[PDB]
Amino acid sequence: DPTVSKYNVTGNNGTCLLASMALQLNITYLKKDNKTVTRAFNISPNDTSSGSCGINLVTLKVENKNRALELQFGMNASSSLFFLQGVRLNMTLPDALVPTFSISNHSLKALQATVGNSYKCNTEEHIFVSKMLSLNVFSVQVQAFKVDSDRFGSVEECVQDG
Ligand SMILES: *[C@@H]1O[C@H](CO)[C@@H](O)[C@H](O)[C@H]1NC(C)=O
Ligand SMILES: *[C@@H]1O[C@H](CO)[C@@H](O)[C@H](O)[C@H]1NC(C)=O
Ligand SMILES: *[C@@H]1O[C@H](CO)[C@@H](O)[C@H](O)[C@H]1NC(C)=O
Ligand SMILES: *[C@@H]1O[C@H](CO)[C@@H](O)[C@H](O)[C@H]1NC(C)=O
């Protein structure tokens, strides 16, 4: 299993993202020898993390020498819901036909919960990013935008955990 890592993003108005989650990139690509391969790359506890705050956009970037993954969270003030709305990936794969590439999708809606509550799920979710890339959220507790007393709000647990 991927390792559960903790994340805290703080900016001008304090903490805007709390997360405890295990993540894995599942990528299908063409190797130099013209063959297709599918590999998993776990987000490592060792990765460098950072992020940014705002009232429309909250980001978390996890990176190392060969890879940078950015999660973008959005929210709808009229509904007071937050959600993962985007994924950006930069990667270098030495054995790929195209070694250095990017994959993105900014039309996502996952990990959705009420603003002021936290999203929690222990059931693996394979989030489609492109035909060739999924973000596997192996387990997660996450909260974006509004954070009170620097801790998770009440849990909204995915139905599948039942
Ligand atoms: C902080 O709050 C102010 C006032 O609510 C808002 O205008 C500003 O965009 C917020 N900044 C961040 C980084 O969330
Ligand atoms: C990917 O690389 C481009 C160009 O260097 C950069 O603008 C972008 O922020 C990078 N994306 C991530 C998620 O680091
Ligand atoms: C934002 O919330 C309002 C109120 O529920 C709704 O009318 C609107 O369609 C929502 N936007 C999106 C993108 O869901
Ligand atoms: C991005 O993800 C959304 C949600 O699954 C999907 O509807 C859309 O087709 C995706 N875009 C691409 C280019 O894969």
Side-chain angles (χ1 to χ4, degrees), residues 8-21:
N8 172 44
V9 178
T10 302
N12 299 331
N13 301 336
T15 299
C16 71
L17 186 76
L18 292 175
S20 178
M21 57 191 177

Side-chain angles (χ1 to χ4, degrees), residues 105 107-108 128-130:
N105 190 333
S107 197
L108 309 179
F128 182 104
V129 178
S130 76

Side-chain angles (χ1 to χ4, degrees), residues 82-100:
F82 67 86
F83 47 89
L84 178 73
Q85 67 179 352
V87 162
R88 301 200 285 168
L89 175 70
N90 289 348
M91 196 165 202
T92 293
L93 295 168
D95 71 340
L97 189 65
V98 183
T100 294

